[PDB]
Amino acid sequence: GAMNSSNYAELFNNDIKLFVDDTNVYRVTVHKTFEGNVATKAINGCIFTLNPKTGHLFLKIIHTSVWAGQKRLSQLAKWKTAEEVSALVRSLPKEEQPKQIIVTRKAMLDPLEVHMLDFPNIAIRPTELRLPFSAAMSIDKLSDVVMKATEPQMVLFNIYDDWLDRISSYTAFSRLTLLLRALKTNEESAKMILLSDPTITIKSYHLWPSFTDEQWITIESQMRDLILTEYGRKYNV
């Protein structure tokens, strides 16, 4: 059924599964018109399809052109996600298609489910986790390719860089989500922490600095400290 802290370590077993985060598919700015009415201007967006076990991310860039002359665009965004997720599965060889797709937002259940009718043995599941995938556009290199695109485009990444060479998927996925949680709650500080030291660099084929084991620990502790500070500020605790 739904995914919560009870059945958490399932993410890392050997059943292929994908997460689908749709929060950044439809992205607008809100501005005032000459007549003083409000209007929206859409910018390029993306679907955040992620295999928590391997790091493989299927960044499906959504070009503003797809909204042209359409109504109820937020409702449509959900169906475009499910249409793109479905064509991604179909594009993959059978032994690579996922056995479960977990949507980060229950509103995706019905559009995915309908688009996956060709795949009755693929379980579409909601989650009760509060995952921070929306902060994915705080990753400079993912925001950069989204914003530069001039057409629909799929860009493949490993979101764990080379971490798995030294840590488990479990640990990778917790480092990922700590980082993204920190990027969500206070982007400016989070990014300060990651980059202060100019002597720790991002390999051209990587998303995050090439921290050593010892440096990741210091980073992880700073990120934790950031997130606990921001909570106290939010709630006056």
């Binding site: 449509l76 169906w79 499910a82 249409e83 019905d110 559009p111 489910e113 309908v114 688009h115 009718l117």
Partner: protein
């Protein structure tokens, strides 16, 4: 006017005929129901005084033969049977009338209620949903499950209602995924009406029969079937105006007839708020809407 005689009444039982019902005491001299209007389907049904569980009953139409009821002590229930000997039947019916042991189908003459609840219900269709073709009449009870309910065990005893499922291949044309799922007109009009039912009267007949089985036997899957057939229409942007008008009459008399105390299990909160207030057809059910608001405002 037709007659359904009873051989005896060995056990205390509440007897229903259509929307009317009578208490009958153990081995009270009761020998049947007279003056039943020819021209419509009818359902005679039963609830034993000892076992308020399992309401059961038989759909029938008098034009199709001479039917009577006989208690069966091995099986413990009132069984409908057919007398093929015409003379021997009129002989029994005449003598019980002379002895006046039969209640009279108590129809007020202003009342179209039973006509309106059964307008499109035809016995030939009833016998395809309840397949048991050695009998002209059709047995249903509380616990019978439907074909859809069996998919998600004994098919001899199944209610073979038409399977409706909004998230199926049937209902969703490839490439119109979003369109067909927010606007079911395709499913309703081409797949179901033109495809399977052939015409709206057969659709409405199934819907009405599902409703009566829910109401007279609290058959849970029949209740699910009615709601499904209502939902499909209310969720279709494009419906023949004559269907919308007849539906509005149909539901009105169903809402009207329903026991006030059962509105908690027989009426699905979500389907009805969607039909009356969210769907394409929100503004098309003026009689149903008005009657639902004044009688069951709480459900809404």
């Amino acid at each position: 006017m037709n007659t359904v005689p009873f051989t005896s009444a060995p056990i205390e039982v509440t007897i229903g005929i259509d929307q009317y019902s009578f208490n009958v005491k153990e081995n009270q001299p009761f020998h049947g129901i007279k003056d039943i209007p020819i021209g419509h389907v009818h359902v005679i049904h039963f609830q034993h005084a000892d076992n308020s569980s399992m309401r059961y009953g038989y759909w029938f139409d008098c034009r199709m033969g001479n039917f009577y009821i006989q208690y069966d002590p091995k099986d413990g229930l009132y069984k409908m049977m057919e007398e093929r000997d015409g003379a021997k039947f009129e002989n029994i019916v005449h003598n019980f009338k002379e002895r006046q042991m039969m209640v009279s189908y108590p129809k007020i003459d202003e009342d179209d209620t039973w006509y309106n609840l059964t307008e499109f219900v035809q016995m030939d269709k009833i016998r395809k949903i309840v397949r048991k073709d050695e009998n002209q009449f059709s047995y249903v009870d509380s616990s019978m499950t439907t074909v859809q309910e069996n998919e998600l065990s004994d098919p001899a005893h199944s209610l073979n209602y038409t399977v409706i499922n909004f998230k199926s291949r049937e209902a969703i044309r490839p490439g119109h995924e979003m369109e067909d799922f927010l606007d079911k007109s395709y499913y309703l009009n081409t797949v179901m009406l033109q495809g399977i039912f052939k015409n709206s009267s057969n659709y409405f007949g199934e819907l009405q029969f599902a409703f009566l089985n829910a109401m007279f036997f609290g058959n849970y899957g029949s209740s699910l079937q009615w709601h499904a057939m209502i939902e499909l229409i209310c969720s279709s942007a494009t419906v023949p105006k004559h269907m919308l008008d007849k539906l509005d009459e149909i539901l009105y008399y169903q809402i009207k007839t329903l026991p006030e105390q059962y509105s908690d299990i027989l009426l699905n909160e979500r389907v009805w708020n969607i039909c009356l207030y969210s769907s394409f057809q929100k503004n098309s059910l003026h009689n149903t809407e008005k009657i639902m608001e004044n009688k069951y405002p709480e459900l809404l």
